[PDB]
Amino acid sequence: GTPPSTRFPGVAIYLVEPRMGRSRRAFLTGLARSKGFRVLDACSSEATHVVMEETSAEEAVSWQERRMAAAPPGCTPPALLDISWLTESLGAGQPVPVECRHRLE
């Protein structure tokens, strides 16, 4: 039953489960899917938007290093930022232009 509920490709969004409340995850999941955002899951570099909950700058940066460590050396790293990007993106119903603000990496 629509296992890959991504709806609109192109905008791959990878969520950091180890640092993301399941309550908020399922909340942004069902929504982003109905809004027009691709929910990138599993260890895939195809992601272009790394959003995480309760994460500081170096906190997400360290995670980025962990992600690249799992990916083949040469793969372009996705957009490391905060979950605040997705929330607002859901409000407007479209992938809003990420600013340096949300990209506090």
Q: Residue 28: which domain range? A: 1-105
Q: Of 82, 71, 24, 75, nearest to 49 (Cα)?
A: 82
Tell me which method was used to determine the 3D structure: NMR
Please give the Cα distance from 61 to 53 (Å, whole number).
14
Which amino acid appears at position 22 of this protein? R
- Cα separation values, 79 from 62, 63, 103, Å: 14, 12, 8
Please give the Cα distance from 5 to 84 (Å, whole number).
21
* CATH code, domain carrying 103: 3.40.50.10190
Dihedrals phi, psi of 101, to nearest 5 degrees:
-60, -60
What is the total count of domains within the chain? 1
In DSSP terms, 80 is beta-bridged to: 50
